Amino acid sequence: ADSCIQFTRHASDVLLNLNRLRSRDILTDVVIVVSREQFRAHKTVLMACSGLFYSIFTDQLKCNLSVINLDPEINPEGFCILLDFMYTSRLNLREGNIMAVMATAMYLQMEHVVDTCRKFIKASE
Amino acid sequence: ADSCIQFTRHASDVLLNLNRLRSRDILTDVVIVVSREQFRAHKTVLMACSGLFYSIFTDQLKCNLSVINLDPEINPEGFCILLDFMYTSRLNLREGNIMAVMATAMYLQMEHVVDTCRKFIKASE
Amino acid sequence: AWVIP
Amino acid sequence: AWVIP
Ligand SMILES: COc1ccc([C@H]2C[C@@H](c3ccc(Cl)cc3)Nc3ncnn32)c(OC)c1OC
Ligand SMILES: COc1ccc([C@H]2C[C@@H](c3ccc(Cl)cc3)Nc3ncnn32)c(OC)c1OC
């Protein structure tokens, strides 16, 4: 219908609550392994934020896996920063992590993050 | 960190993508039965929007059910309207459905929806 | 909150 | 879009 009203804060409130479920380990259904580190998450949130996870979890075999191992070249802190961005909209971008964050965002197919990393790098050169 | 940047549209984009997963029946993990009607959804989105579903899916036995049957007094169209609100932030509130929407929102423990229903009813009296 | 979208 | 929250 074209007659709907909208609650402005709803999408933000949903994301806050999904991150609270992740913090409490409620209904997490996948572990992402990045070298020596493991991160528990919800497949639907990963798919909704990343083109790589969208492809993985729509594959008829990989959709059923409970563990996904990422490429060993992926930096765990870079992944942690991007997973926190997925669940909060906030990206902890710092001089010390920007190259790892950008490389991880390219691998995860997160173009908006890649774009801001490129802009911050270009401003310092 | 206090140094984060934020992507304004992220939470809205996540919700649009979760609703696209629901439309395509991707990774839905529960069927909600309302009298003769069935609705497929994602438990995490329901929990993030409703106090009743938060209680159900944090219960150690009910968290594992793949079908949840609602009270027979719940109107299926009222539930459909609220499920669409959960996944889109938009509530199709009309003179013809407001009483059913309000009763369903009280049962699902969705206080912001109950509040706007009460305001619209009060304005017409 | 509520608005006309 | 990006902002300072
Ligand atoms: C409106 O068209 C589309 C909308 C959404 C998707 C994908 C995108 C995918 C995604 C990719 C990259 C990023 Cl940064 C974030 C999310 N996640 C997703 N969840 C549900 N659907 N979709 C699409 O890819 C199939 C679309 O056809 C181009
Ligand atoms: C900051 O404190 C809390 C934040 C969130 C929740 C619940 C609320 C619950 C919910 C209830 C009602 C509505 Cl309208 C929408 C959502 N959904 C949820 N997903 C994850 N956590 N929570 C809480 O309930 C345990 C909180 O302690 C009061």
Numbering used by the authors:
A (entry chain A), B (entry chain A): 5 to 129
C (entry chain B), D (entry chain B): 0 to 4
Question: What did the study's authors say about this model?
Answer:
We solved the crystal structures of the BCL6 BTB domain bound to 9 different hits at a resolution ranging between 1.38 and 1.85 Å, which corresponds to a 69% success rate. As expected, in all 12 ligand-bound BCL6 structures the compound binds in site 1, which is consistent with the competition with the peptide-based probes in the LO-NMR and FP assays. Importantly, all compounds, except the cyano-trifluoromethyl pyridines 11 and 13, interact via an H-bond between an NH group and the main chain carbonyl of Met51 in BCL6 similar to the interaction formed by the Trp509 and His1426 side chains in the BCOR and SMRT corepressor peptides. Furthermore, all compounds except 11 have a substituent that stacks against the main chain of BCL6 residues 53–55, mimicking the interactions of the side chains of His1426 and Trp509 in the SMRT and BCOR peptides.
B-cell lymphoma 6 (BCL6) protein, a member of the Broad-Complex, Tramtrack and Bric-à-brac (BTB) / Pox virus and Zinc finger (POZ) family of transcription factors, plays a key role in the formation and maintenance of B-cell germinal centres. BCL6 has an N-terminal BTB domain, responsible for obligate homodimerisation; a long unstructured central region involved in interaction with the MTA3/NuRD complex; and six C-terminal C2H2-type Zinc-fingers involved in DNA binding. We established a robust, soakable, high-resolution BCL6 BTB domain crystal system which allowed us to elucidate the binding mode of all nine hit series and map the binding site hot spots in relation to the binding of the corepressor peptides.
